[PDB]
């Protein structure tokens, strides 16, 4: 059944989206908003009022206090907007490279494992957004390893904190310990923690 | 407790959203070890270089920085339609997100049009300035040896040759036979 | 006077100025002459204008700017000073303004000299420094007087 | 006495081409020259294949110069925002290791 209108011009539209992506900073947000609204319309997730951060008794437990402070330091309050955004940006195109909201953490206390879990969950719930911020995550994880697993750490970092991939497809580790920066996300380099090379 | 809400409901919202009109990029291959985003620039022989993806750091938009802490409320203070005991699932009308995708597209084409238009003009379009020195007496102005500056060739001829998948044209030294030039031209 | 050309109604002057300006050895210009964009932001940073100004002032001004630019010290380097005045292992994050916010490197040599000299001329300098330290200890809330 | 005198008698004479004692400005006042990579000002080269004479090398005065300057994009001396993050526990701080 004929619709008396012009055909959707795939080619022209993609070219213009590229041009806008290269020239119009607001573009990212625009697309994200669409996605956000969609999540909001799907009614998939809402913030309940009561928190369930801790097992029964543990919050009032006096020997749990450092742990409870750690979790509470990590656990931000639920908001529909930040959450819908977190879901939506998994699908939304990225034009400005994302950065991790930096965490200072020495990893002395066992409770510091919370931060590690915070990443793992983020890598499960949001593999894409994770893959974007993951070298910046490696900077934190390297502290975690050097503190918790010093000898494995020395070995790993002796192999190199980053690697590249030759035309053959084999990984080539730097052999050098160096802090990752998102300047690198657009480069040939990968953070080495995620190589999954034994 | 919440895992069913994720796998058996939210997954579909992702699968739909990935098919949305303006979600045009390939964000992630599922392999952290190997994946890199495809990288593009709008680029001109005249010297423009506008990367599509670039690292400018924190912006006014508030999208660039990621608080990962968001995972906590998602685990420990969100309800879902699947958890719990029955709540009707919502299947959103396609028309709203579709029509806003479309209105965004037209808003963009309208927005980039003035730049696309002025630049079409500033480029000088699909033609080149060309001198024609005459090799003989009783030569018409049209007749002679056609020649153009390398800058014109770069702006206008070269990318087209690149795009047509043909070998780059031969240089002509003082020892160039007409047959070589012929082979080059036919190439 | 180069601007006078073909505007001065004085004939010989316009002839002489035209003659000088037509020599190979001299060329008037009223800049902008040289843009320099940033390597990341791709926006202009340091432009060179051909101002009408005596070459002495131009030289001093260019020396000043040369110093500021060639130091390769951004505002981010200030973090290093802050760390010195912070409790050990304070962390300092962001915002990575980069090349767009240059500053001069802290001048170790001149400061240590001026301090030695001051300490020689003004022994009471001791009491200034101590006072700074005192305030810090007081701010650190490490110890308090008590009635008990 | 007239050591400061760049110009003189900017007037036409009716009988003659230039008034006697009329003085034109020196060419040096009008050579904008260039800014060298060092940041020193230079006069234009007298000829091809020659570098320009530095303006500070000779005794002539020059009134067109290339002053480098910063645009609105570069800014210096502004105060800078930062997120300080204090140590989690004072007792865990390491004063010592080299």
């Amino acid at each position: 059944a004929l619709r008396p209108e012009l055909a959707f011009d795939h080619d022209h539209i993609i070219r213009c989206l590229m041009l806008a992506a290269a020239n119009y900073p607001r573009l990212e947000g625009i697309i994200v908003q669409i996605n956000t609204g969609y999540v909001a319309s799907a009614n998939v997730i809402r913030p309940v009022s009561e928190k369930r951060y801790f097992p029964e008794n543990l919050e009032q437990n006096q020997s749990a206090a450092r742990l409870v402070s750690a979790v509470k330091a990590r656990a931000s309050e639920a908001d529909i907007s930040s959450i819908h955004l977190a879901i939506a940006r998994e699908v939304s195109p990225m034009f400005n490279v994302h950065e991790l909201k930096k965490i200072a953490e020495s990893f002395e206390d066992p409770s510091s494992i919370v931060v590690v879990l915070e990443f793992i969950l983020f890598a499960l719930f949001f593999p894409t957004e994770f893959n974007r911020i993951k070298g910046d995550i490696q900077n934190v994880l390297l502290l975690f390893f050097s503190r918790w697993y010093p000898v494995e750490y020395g070995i790993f970092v002796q192999r190199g904190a980053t690697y590249t991939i030759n035309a053959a497809g084999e990984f080539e580790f730097s052999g050098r310990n160096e802090k990752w920066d998102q300047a690198l996300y657009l480069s040939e380099h990968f953070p080495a923690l995620f190589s999954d090379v034994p | 407790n919440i895992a069913v809400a994720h796998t058996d409901h939210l997954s579909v919202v992702y699968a739909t959203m990935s098919n949305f009109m303006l979600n045009f990029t390939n964000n992630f291959s599922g392999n952290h070890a190997t994946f890199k985003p495809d990288q593009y620039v709008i680029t001109s022989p005249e010297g423009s270089y506008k990367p599509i993806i670039e690292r400018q750091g924190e912006t006014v938009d508030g999208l660039t920085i990621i608080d990962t802490s968001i995972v906590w409320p998602i685990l420990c203070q969100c309800t879902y339609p699947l958890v719990r005991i029955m709540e009707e699932i919502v299947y959103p009308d396609p028309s709203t997100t579709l029509s806003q995708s479309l209105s965004v597209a037209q808003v963009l084409s309208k927005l980039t049009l003035p730049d696309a238009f002025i630049n079409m003009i500033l480029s000088g379009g699909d033609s080149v300035v060309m001198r024609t020195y005459q090799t003989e007496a009783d030569d018409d102005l049209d007749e002679g040896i056609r020649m153009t500056t390398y800058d014109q060739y770069l702006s206008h001829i070269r990318e087209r040759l690149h795009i047509t998948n043909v070998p780059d044209p031969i240089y002509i030294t003082g020892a160039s036979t007409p047959d070589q030039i012929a082979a080059s031209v036919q190439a | 006077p180069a601007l006078l050309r073909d505007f001065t109604q004085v004939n010989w002057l316009n002839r002489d100025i035209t003659n000088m300006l037509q020599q190979a050895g001299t060329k008037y210009g009223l800049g902008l002459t040289e843009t320099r964009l940033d390597y990341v932001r791709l926006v202009k940073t340091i432009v060179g204008h051909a101002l009408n100004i005596d070459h002495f002032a131009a030289s001093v001004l260019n020396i000043n700017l040369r110093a500021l630019m060639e130091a390769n010290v951004t505002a981010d380097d200030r973090i290093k000073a802050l760390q010195a005045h912070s409790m050990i292992s304070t962390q300092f994050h962001g915002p990575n303004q980069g090349a767009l916010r240059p500053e001069l490197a802290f001048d170790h040599d001149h400061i240590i000299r001026c301090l030695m000299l001051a300490a020689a001329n003004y022994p009471r300098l001791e009491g200034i420094i101590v006072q700074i330290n005192t305030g810090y200890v007081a701010s650190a809330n490490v110890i308090r007087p008590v009635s008990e | 006495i007239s050591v400061a005198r760049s110009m003189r008698a900017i007037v036409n004479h009716n009988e003659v081409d230039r008034p006697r004692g009329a003085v034109a400005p020196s060419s040096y006042e009008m050579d904008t020259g260039t800014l060298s990579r060092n940041g020193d000002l230079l006069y234009s080269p007298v000829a091809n294949g020659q570098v320009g004479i530095p303006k500070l090398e000779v005794d002539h005065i020059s009134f067109s110069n290339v002053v480098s300057m910063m645009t609105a994009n570069i800014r210096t001396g502004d105060d800078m925002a930062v997120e300080r993050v204090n140590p989690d526990d004072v007792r865990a701080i390491n004063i010592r290791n080299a």
Partner: peptide, 15 residues
């Protein structure tokens, strides 16, 4: 506490 996608500055360094 609250979620904040942004650098959460508090100090200002003088030049």
């Amino acid at each position: 506490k609250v979620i904040f996608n942004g650098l959460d500055v508090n100090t200002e360094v003088q030049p």
